Design a protein around this nucleic acid. Sequence first.
RNA 1: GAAGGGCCGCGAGCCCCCGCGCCUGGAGGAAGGAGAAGUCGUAACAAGGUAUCCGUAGGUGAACCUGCGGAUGGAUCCUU
RNA 2: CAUCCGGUCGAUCCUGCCGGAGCGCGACGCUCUCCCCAAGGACGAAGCCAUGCAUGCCCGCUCACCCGGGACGCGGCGGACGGCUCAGGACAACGGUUGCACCCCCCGCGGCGGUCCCUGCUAGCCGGACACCGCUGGCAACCCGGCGCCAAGACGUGCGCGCACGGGCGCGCGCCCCGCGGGCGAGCAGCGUGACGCAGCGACGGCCCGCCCGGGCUUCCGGGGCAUCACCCGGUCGGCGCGGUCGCGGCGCGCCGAGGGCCCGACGCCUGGCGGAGAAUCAGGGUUCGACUCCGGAGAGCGGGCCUGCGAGACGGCCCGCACAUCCAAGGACGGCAGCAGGCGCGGAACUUGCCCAAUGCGCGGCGCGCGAGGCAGCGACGGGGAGCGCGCGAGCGAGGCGGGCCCACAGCCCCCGCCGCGCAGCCGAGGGCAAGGUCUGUGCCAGCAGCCGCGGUAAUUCCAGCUCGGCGAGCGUCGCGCGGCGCUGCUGCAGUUGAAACGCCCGUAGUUGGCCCCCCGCCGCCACGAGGAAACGGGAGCGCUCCAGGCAGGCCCGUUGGCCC
Lengths: 259, 136, 175, 163, 74
Amino acid sequence: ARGVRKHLKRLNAPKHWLLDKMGGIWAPRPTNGPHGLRECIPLILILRNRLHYANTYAETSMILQDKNVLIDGKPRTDPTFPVGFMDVFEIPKVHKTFRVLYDVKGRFTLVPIQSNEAGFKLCRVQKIFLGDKMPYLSTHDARTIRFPHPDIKTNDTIKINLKTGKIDEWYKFDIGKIVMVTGGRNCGRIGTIQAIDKHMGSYTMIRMKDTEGTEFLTRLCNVFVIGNDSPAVAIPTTKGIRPDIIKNRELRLRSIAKR
Amino acid sequence: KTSGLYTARKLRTVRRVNRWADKKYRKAHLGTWLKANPLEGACMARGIVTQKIGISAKQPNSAVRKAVRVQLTKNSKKITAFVPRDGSITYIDNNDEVLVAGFGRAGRAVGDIPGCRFKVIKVAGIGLLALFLRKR
Amino acid sequence: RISRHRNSSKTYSTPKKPFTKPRLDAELKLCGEYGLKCKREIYRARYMLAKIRRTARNLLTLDENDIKRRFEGAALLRRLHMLGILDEEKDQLDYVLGLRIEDIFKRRLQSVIVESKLAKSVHHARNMIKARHISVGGQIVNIPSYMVRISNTSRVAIADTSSLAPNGKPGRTKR
Amino acid sequence: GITHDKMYKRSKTGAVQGKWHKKRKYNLGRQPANTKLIVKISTIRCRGGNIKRRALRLSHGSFAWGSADISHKARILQVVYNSTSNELVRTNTLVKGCVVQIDSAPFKSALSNDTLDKEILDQIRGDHILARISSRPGQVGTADGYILEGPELLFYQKKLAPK
Amino acid sequence: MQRSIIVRRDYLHFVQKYKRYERRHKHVAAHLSPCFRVKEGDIVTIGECRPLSKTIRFNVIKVEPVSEARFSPF
RNA sequence: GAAGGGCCGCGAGCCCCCGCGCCUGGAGGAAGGAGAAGUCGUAACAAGGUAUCCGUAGGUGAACCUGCGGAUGGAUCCUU
RNA sequence: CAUCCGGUCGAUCCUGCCGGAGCGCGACGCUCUCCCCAAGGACGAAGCCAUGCAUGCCCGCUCACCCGGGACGCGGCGGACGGCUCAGGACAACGGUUGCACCCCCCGCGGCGGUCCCUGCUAGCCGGACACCGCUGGCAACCCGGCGCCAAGACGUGCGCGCACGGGCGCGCGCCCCGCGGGCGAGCAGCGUGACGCAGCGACGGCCCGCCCGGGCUUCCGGGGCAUCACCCGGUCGGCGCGGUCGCGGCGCGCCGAGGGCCCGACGCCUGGCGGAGAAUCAGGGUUCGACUCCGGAGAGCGGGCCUGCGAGACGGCCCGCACAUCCAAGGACGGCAGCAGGCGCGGAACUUGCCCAAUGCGCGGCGCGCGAGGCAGCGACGGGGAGCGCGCGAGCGAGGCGGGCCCACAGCCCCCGCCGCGCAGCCGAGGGCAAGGUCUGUGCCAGCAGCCGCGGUAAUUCCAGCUCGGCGAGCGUCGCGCGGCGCUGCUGCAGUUGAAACGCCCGUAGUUGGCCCCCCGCCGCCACGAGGAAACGGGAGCGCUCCAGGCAGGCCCGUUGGCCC
């Protein structure tokens, strides 16, 4: 269409975002950045529509321009900033610290953390590139790191210190790793890998066993290592056990009675 | 009939060729009717009445059904349309705008009016029914 | 316009044959008994019952305890039980079949006020609701076909500002 | 308006295709810059704004002798054997794969050297060492090539043979 | 053609209204490198490649020769 | 390095010539269908007063008539 | 969400249509007591357009007016998105599925940052100069001429790590292959070493690499009719070398072959052809429509060509031919509503030449402007929803009216108040289908009615009135269309002795179809379940918008929701 599409329609927006059909013909277009539009939530949704700090966009802009927002140690002044998996969302004036993890409904739920919990962002190695004569690695948030420990292979786990912009810890992707799923039918689910099938050609399919017993199979890329034999991050209360439809009705029915 | 797991093409071809055999499908989907219809796909059309004429009733009924010879403006095709209701031909005058709509038989003729495919509905921009009831 | 986005739907189904007299007579009885202004109100409840019974027909074919059977059976029986269209004793997918236009009409609130003696006649009851003199949980309702629920049956009562020591002046008394 | 679209072409069955869109700028082609050889490198702005160098007239290039590992700039004396059009040989146009006579003077010292073959050392005396251009001057803006070595030479000597 | 073959693909397409399939055919142009030897009527494997001609986007990987002399879905 | 000038490239438009699809004006000819009924016979239906009918050929105001080979849907399930 | 009924006869049983009966979506008639929602110049005119308006923002630089605000200018960023329409286009678009070891990309985000000599350089730091402007101007207009003053994060230069460094150019694995990587299913990358070239960018240093998003092509499958179109093509089909491109490829050009496509329908022709998600109708299997709401395509009167660009073959850019215009002072200039309003033409048909950025997003700016995107009203019986025209013998309303709140960008609307208080039905019908007069007049095969069968020729169940009565109801009738009816298109599931229809016969190629037969696998088709795939919609969980059509709300709350299915 002669160039990039700046606007984005409300109907043509991801379902993990949860826009309302009405209220606008437009939904926020996430400006290019650490996370991709399909797999990121703009900050305006997490600020005026989920923590409900601001009423409108204009309000959100003022409290974003003021350096109060803190994503990954950076001031961040734009409302449609992309936020993504394992991105620390710290709000300091309100003194609440959270990390944006996925949820068992498949949407992204802000997971409350401590000051000690904040300061580290877990990352996934996508590719190792030898450009400019130095080895670099690829993370989902577009972070690029020169001279990796040669032991790190692929689809591995990184933990940026976020203070020196260097990896702190590395988990090797193999059978036996607590993992959360960042895409697909199986999403926001923490369980541990049972098999990684190569399928020479394309699309490696890994099968993973949840704690309770649910076995679910998804693509390799959809996986995101969360730890080794321990979660290594705060697990959202449900620890991605994943409810049956009837149990979900009963959770809603019990909740309604209490209110 | 053709009965093979691999005979879908023949069965599709037979339906395509045989479907046109029913007269109503041919009227609806050939496209010859759309060119021919004095009202081309329209519910109705406006025209000027050149002559007020009466068409003798087909047997066994005996009557001078009152009709108008109207030249439809959209196609410049002259046509015959019945003026409905009792003594309502009086409202029609030659050289007067009229709106002509179908007789409900989809281009066919109804009852004893021979070769009349339409009825006037509005004369001089006023509905014929309203004039007969003296509403206007 | 996001106005285009708003969904609208017909809520009633008309009869396949318009002049079946046995039915036309049976309908007249329902209208006179339930004070229904038009046959459309009789058809709207027929449509509501049809869907409700079509769903329980589909559900009954599904094998017992078929996960979706358990999930959708509850939301049918339990929402009907709240509405009160079904008496709570039955509580099984077999007896949703056997409901009638009268069962829906029974909870209309025109009937509920006549049933508890608040309104002498359905014709009087419709007149009462349109003058804002009936309340459910102290809600001044202007709707004759409110479709009141089992729990909200007890709350149905005369309005605070209409007859029991209220202003009691605007209207005939004020003159 | 030169274009590299497939819309203008016929189908594999020879059926005329119908034109759905008007010419696009992304599907564009440019007038060939036949590189004349003197006996200027133009800059053009491509897609992405990348600038490709187009040599229009280029005097000399970095030719090379791989077996003897000696590579020096040399002057392009004359062009022989285009292999696509005889017209290009007599207009001295410079394309990749174009046999050319480079001046033997930069490589003159190796004449004293020996054991780097014998046929190639005979060419050193004449002023005519055969060399195929290896770089598309229209796209890369340079005419760097390689001296013909071994059987390729014998084929290109037989082609150039006085008959 | 010169170092190129046309591979006939035979497959069944299922028309939904008639609960029946249709035998259907598509012809794929492939590059037959001089290494393998191909005579007409022989099964070959063709792999996708950068377009190498207007019609050739596939290159023969293997030839399974058949006997000296139907519709076969491969 | 401007105006310009040349050779090619891309290519509008026009000008012929050609093909294609459509849409139309026709003196005059020839149908068909509808009106209520006129004129001339009576061809078919009762063996309809020459059983009809089919193919084909010819001839007549008109239905039609006639030859030649069929058919029975005929008026014959039947007679060394 | 498995239904029929009226009509050939003197009757009958059929075939078979005709007609009804249902549901949409638009036009027309007549009529609309109030509120809530909501479609709205698409329909062989992608015809033409008066006028108004739809893209600005910014301060890098600031010696007219006003103060810290700068106007104008130059500079930057955007104007390629959005809004609009469906003309073109039928192995095309478009859908699902692959690839790019054949690729381009602004922003943002994360890395990374060494910049050759040598002459002349200033690196506490370079020029000269343009616009605005001062002067002096022509021109009907449009348009702009000179001469001087003078700034930038503008312009051009430019010192700077000979592990200096862009592009491209050489030589750098194999011993039958495959069994490690910086890596890969893949010999790909990177580097070393030759030589070329001096690419960056440096006057508020940043190239470059990545990721993202958005492309460009691409693989497989699906992707209209017409045989009164049967053969077709001739860069057409392959090879090879060059060129061109962002790259790939007959993409272009030589050269060299002779292919390539087709009754499994090629090619030709035609379309009142944008496709999909979907919409209508609706046991099932289906039929029909795919203007428009989201997604992808295409286009800006009709063709071409370009420039600027990171991206446009851009038209609220330019240039040219064409077609139709406009103003003229007669020499010139200048259009482009398939943006939102509005007119004209056309048609059966389709709204205001409002108000506004307050929301929602986007552009620019970090402390706010701009937007006919939108929002808000106005018009609006496309439609959808919910209430009225009384109840009861006594009370009352709501429709109003008028003030106040509240609401709203501002009104208003709803709603809440006090205060008075004005209820009101149409449109089709009563012989049958098909519910409801064997009433009384007029009229006498007239007038008219009647989808259909039939009524009317003097005791008219059918016309014209009155009278009653039915049906639906603020709507009802009519006309056109699609579906159902319809098993009258038949895969399920039609019929062919006589109702319509077995070719006069026989051979026969494609096509279609093939006896029985091996338990054990290889490839099929097949079937089961996987992943992975936009929402809207549809189905569906919860939730009293007063009910409701709705909407995702809400309540001190599963990580309160907003599940799940397609």
